[PDB]
Curated annotation (Swiss-Prot):
Membership in a protein family: Belongs to the HAD-like hydrolase superfamily. NagD family.
SUPFAM superfamilies linked to this entry: HAD-like (SSF56784)
Name of the molecule in the record: 5'-nucleotidase YutF
The organism of origin for this protein: Bacillus subtilis (strain 168)
EC number: 3.1.3.5
Catalyses which reaction(s): a ribonucleoside 5'-phosphate + H2O = a ribonucleoside + phosphate; XMP + H2O = xanthosine + phosphate
GO molecular function: metal ion binding; phosphatase activity; XMP 5'-nucleosidase activity
Gene that this sequence comes from: yutF
Matches recorded under Pfam families: Hydrolase_6 (PF13344), Hydrolase_like (PF13242)
Location in the cell: Cytoplasm
Main location class: cytoplasm
Length: 257
């Protein structure tokens, strides 16, 4: 049997969009959801880019995405914090994405005495930036990291990822951070708040097991793994396909005109 899903979370971080064929396939997949009135969000562990930046790029490939249909770990982070304390102050390490999310969720920026410390990727990192974060934590700040990814694949090779930079604070202070992004469930839970659907009716679509699928599994939601081209104690994705095109008939069969 195939369940009827009322909402889709679609991962942006994998190889699912590599090359002309894949991009066109993703376009037809998303247009099917839109055509059939099914709500979706694009999700990402990238804390640096703003939802406008991400949606603009999707739209440049004719993939239909408003700014409101992009949900980043920065947004999950700020929502999480606002739900802890509506008027929280936050010392932020990171780039434009996380700063905008903090701003837009009614939170304020602080320093050595902030309520929270947040670490998101910062290619302009400095010793003093680490230092202020450490001091804030030792002064009692709750410690949050947007995402634990250890490295970023580039043409140069594998560069330091946010998980590696986060570690400076973890080690120096002895305080373990709350990670927001994949494979943790928080990003999924915060996404569902925006999407407006239940765990039982939401599908997470991704192309990497360790991050995308595990995030869905940890949140208790069904998953769809796309093999772009598994130990027994390892929980399988609910569904698996080679191309997003394969899922189109299932959308159409469950969401009619």
């Amino acid at each position: 049997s195939l369940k009827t899903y009322k909402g889709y979370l679609i991962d942006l971080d994998g190889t699912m969009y590599n090359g002309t064929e894949k991009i066109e396939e993703a376009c037809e997949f998303v247009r099917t959801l839109k055509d059939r009135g099914v709500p979706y969000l694009f999700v990402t562990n990238n804390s640096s880019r703003t939802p406008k930046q991400v949606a603009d790029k999707l739209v440049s490939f004719d993939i239909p995405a408003t700014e409101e249909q992009v949900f980043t770990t920065s947004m999950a982070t700020a929502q999480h914090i606002a739900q802890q304390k509506k008027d929280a102050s936050v010392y932020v390490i990171g780039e434009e994405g996380i700063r905008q999310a903090i701003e837009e969720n009614g939170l304020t920026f602080g320093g050595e005495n902030a309520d929270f410390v947040v670490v998101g990727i910062d290619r302009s990192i400095t010793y003093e930036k680490f230092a202020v974060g450490c001091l804030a934590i030792r002064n009692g700040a709750r410690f949050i990291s947007t995402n634990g990814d250890i490295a970023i694949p580039t043409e140069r090779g594998l560069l330091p990822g946010n998980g590696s930079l986060t570690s400076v604070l973890t080690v120096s202070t002895g305080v373990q951070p709350v990670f927001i992004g994949k494979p943790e469930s928080i990003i999924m839970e915060q996404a569902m708040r925006v999407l407006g659907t239940d765990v039982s009716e939401t599908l997470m679509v991704g192309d990497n097991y360790a991050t995308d699928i595990m995030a869905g599994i940890n949140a208790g939601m069904d998953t769809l793994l796309v093999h772009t081209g598994m130990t027994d104690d390892m929980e399988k994705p609910t569904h698996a396909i080679d191309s997003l095109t394969e899922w189109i008939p299932y959308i159409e069969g469950h969401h009619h005109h």
